[PDB]
Design a protein around this motif. Structure first.
Motif, PDB file in Angstrom:
ATOM      1  N   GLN A   1       0.811  -1.264  -0.049  1.00 40.13           N
ATOM      2  CA  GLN A   1      -0.034  -0.074  -0.186  1.00 40.13           C
ATOM      3  C   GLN A   1       0.907   1.433  -0.007  1.00 40.13           C
ATOM      4  O   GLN A   1       1.318   1.915   0.999  1.00 40.13           O
ATOM      5  CB  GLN A   1      -1.035   0.086   1.267  1.00 40.13           C
ATOM      6  CG  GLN A   1      -1.917   1.429   1.160  1.00 40.13           C
ATOM      7  CD  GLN A   1      -3.252   1.115   1.676  1.00 40.13           C
ATOM      8  OE1 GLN A   1      -3.412   0.678   2.832  1.00 40.13           O
ATOM      9  NE2 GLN A   1      -4.465   1.575   0.953  1.00 40.13           N
TER      10      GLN A   1
ATOM     11  N   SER B   1      -4.250   1.148  -3.336  1.00 35.59           N
ATOM     12  CA  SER B   1      -4.827   0.161  -2.770  1.00 35.59           C
ATOM     13  C   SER B   1      -3.541  -0.886  -2.251  1.00 35.59           C
ATOM     14  O   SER B   1      -2.538  -0.918  -2.608  1.00 35.59           O
ATOM     15  CB  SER B   1      -5.801  -0.688  -3.488  1.00 35.59           C
ATOM     16  OG  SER B   1      -6.701   0.161  -4.040  1.00 35.59           O
ATOM     17  N   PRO B   2      -3.752  -1.738  -1.162  1.00 31.67           N
ATOM     18  CA  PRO B   2      -2.955  -2.565  -0.893  1.00 31.67           C
ATOM     19  C   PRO B   2      -2.482  -3.642  -1.929  1.00 31.67           C
ATOM     20  O   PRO B   2      -3.343  -4.063  -2.645  1.00 31.67           O
ATOM     21  CB  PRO B   2      -3.809  -3.307   0.233  1.00 31.67           C
ATOM     22  CG  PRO B   2      -4.387  -2.311   1.050  1.00 31.67           C
ATOM     23  CD  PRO B   2      -5.069  -1.653  -0.417  1.00 31.67           C
ATOM     24  N   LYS B   3      -1.318  -4.383  -1.708  1.00 29.54           N
ATOM     25  CA  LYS B   3      -1.017  -5.273  -2.814  1.00 29.54           C
ATOM     26  C   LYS B   3      -0.255  -6.222  -2.053  1.00 29.54           C
ATOM     27  O   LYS B   3       0.541  -5.771  -1.154  1.00 29.54           O
ATOM     28  CB  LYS B   3      -0.094  -4.441  -3.806  1.00 29.54           C
ATOM     29  CG  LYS B   3       0.705  -5.583  -4.934  1.00 29.54           C
ATOM     30  CD  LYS B   3      -0.609  -6.157  -5.747  1.00 29.54           C
ATOM     31  CE  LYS B   3       0.165  -7.371  -6.413  1.00 29.54           C
ATOM     32  NZ  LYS B   3       0.539  -8.599  -5.634  1.00 29.54           N
TER      33      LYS B   3
END
Ligand code: PNB
Lengths: 219, 226
Positions: free
Chosen positions: A43, A48-50
């Motif tokens: 993130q 967005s988070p990854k």
């Protein structure tokens, strides 16, 4: 269920140096199949988070050879050998071994960069705003490092007046500077009584240089 | 190309309800589980539920059982999540993702794809459109080489506003600063540094859109005539 605890809360790293985020868990994460379901997310600012690492040590497609997943029992560790500017973000750890999947609280990475002086820009209130009886003189200070910088508003040669409001941005994960906007909001009356407005910027300490200013009337 | 697109910024009155949406494309919708997440302040990142569009089978985190409800539309390849009896505690950013996990047995991980996110604000306060003010320089000229322009989006509620220059046709060099809640009312600004070649001649317009109030304002940044 299950409590994941991360440390440190935040951490500064000079590009090139390593870093070690830690994630301790409240229970064992070993599943019947002998598998340990522990992943690490990123993130970056504004995204967005990854997923970066799954199954404790398995790097995802695209992840650099600089990241290292590790751990055993209840202690887990994410190691970054050589920190690059693009690793800016808030790393998170998620346990998947027990149903209510739970996350850590994140650790904020901050890229330590060499000092850099800003570029000041001051703007007089818009005539449009003046017709409503207010006045916001804006000063944009951007592309600087370190973060916390001192901005000074000197109205008509003297101190502050009619309260200032400040706002910084996230570090640029491309380069590694910052940006801030200082807004001085006086009423129409107060603005119409003074004529010289200045925006000085003190690089951490000393007598504030880097000054930009305009003159009311003569504009 | 795999893409997950989510609904826009919702502003809801307490006690009511909203339905968010995640529209997939690029992959085969019904062959994968879709997970929904909550990113609140303080609370911070909680797993809500998941759904398998193929069989319509769901799974709910005990903590959100009776608050959230998942569904899916095969024809459109769009998954929905519904939040009932909203409260201040429900205000946060919700995400949807094609996590990619298989089964305890396959132990295979397909590349995860995440949607952009949806800000949900549970509030009773009245909506207030922003006041856009075009800020131009002056005096002995300002910003010599590159000139910086600015836009002040003052006094609105709630967030977010979407500032853009020349409708996106001016993307490099823009800076947008976080809105700061003053008197139960926000204020934000943005700068754009364009070379002097296109400043005097060549139009520059600050376009702010306020979703929560169906408002759009276009301010042509003009010089000083005095
Ligand atoms: O379901 C259980 O009972 C058995 N355990 C499992 O199936 C392990 C799941 C492994 P994993 O895919 O990491 O699941 C946890 C998990 C799921 C989603 C997520 N996310 O960020 O969206 C983060 C973490």
């Amino acid at each position: 269920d299950i409590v994941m605890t991360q440390s440190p809360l935040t951490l500064s790293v000079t590009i090139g140096q390593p870093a070690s985020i830690s994630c301790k868990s409240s229970q064992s994460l070993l599943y019947s199949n002998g598998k340990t379901y522990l992943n690490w997310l990123l993130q970056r600012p504004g995204q967005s988070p990854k997923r970066l690492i799954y199954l404790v040590s398995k790097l995802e497609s695209g992840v650099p050879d600089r990241f290292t997943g590790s751990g055993s029992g209840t202690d887990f560790t994410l190691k970054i050998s050589r920190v690059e500017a693009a690793d800016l973000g808030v790393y998170y750890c998620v346990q998947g071994t027990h149903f209510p999947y739970t996350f850590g609280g994140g650790t904020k990475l901050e890229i330590l960069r060499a000092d850099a002086a800003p570029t000041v820009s001051i703007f007089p209130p818009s005539s449009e705003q003046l017709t409503s009886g207010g006045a916001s003189v804006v000063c944009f200070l951007n592309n600087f490092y370190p973060k916390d910088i001192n901005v000074k508003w000197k109205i008509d040669g003297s101190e502050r007046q009619n309260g200032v409001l400040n706002s910084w941005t996230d570090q640029d994960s491309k380069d590694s500077t910052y940006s801030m906007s200082s807004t001085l909001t006086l009423t129409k009356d107060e603005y119409e009584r003074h004529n010289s407005y200045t925006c000085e910027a003190t690089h951490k300490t000393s007598t504030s240089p880097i000054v930009k200013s305009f003159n009311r009337n003569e504009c | 190309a795999v893409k997950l697109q989510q609904s826009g910024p919702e502003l809801v009155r307490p006690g009511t309800s909203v339905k968010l949406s995640c529209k997939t494309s690029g992959y085969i919708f019904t062959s994968y589980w879709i997970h929904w997440l909550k990113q609140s302040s303080g609370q911070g990142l909680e797993w809500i539920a998941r759904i398998y569009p193929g069989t319509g089978g769901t799974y709910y985190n005990e903590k959100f059982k009776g608050k959230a409800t998942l569904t899916a539309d095969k024809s459109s390849s769009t998954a929905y999540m519904q939040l009932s009896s909203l409260k201040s505690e429900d205000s946060a950013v919700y995400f949807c993702t094609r996590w990619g996990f298989t089964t305890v047995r396959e132990n295979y991980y397909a590349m995860d794809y995440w949607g952009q996110g949806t800000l949900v604000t549970v509030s009773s306060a009245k909506t207030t459109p922003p006041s856009v003010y075009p800020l131009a320089p002056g005096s002995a000229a300002q910003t010599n080489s590159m000139v910086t322009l600015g836009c002040l989006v003052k006094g609105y509620f709630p967030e977010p506003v979407t500032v853009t220059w020349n409708s996106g046709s001016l993307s490099s060099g823009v800076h947008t600063f976080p809105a700061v809640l003053q008197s139960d009312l926000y204020t934000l600004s943005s700068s754009v540094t364009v070379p002097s070649s296109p400043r005097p001649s060549e139009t520059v317009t600050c376009n702010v859109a306020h979703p929560a109030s169906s408002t759009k304002v276009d301010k042509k940044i003009v010089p000083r005539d005095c």
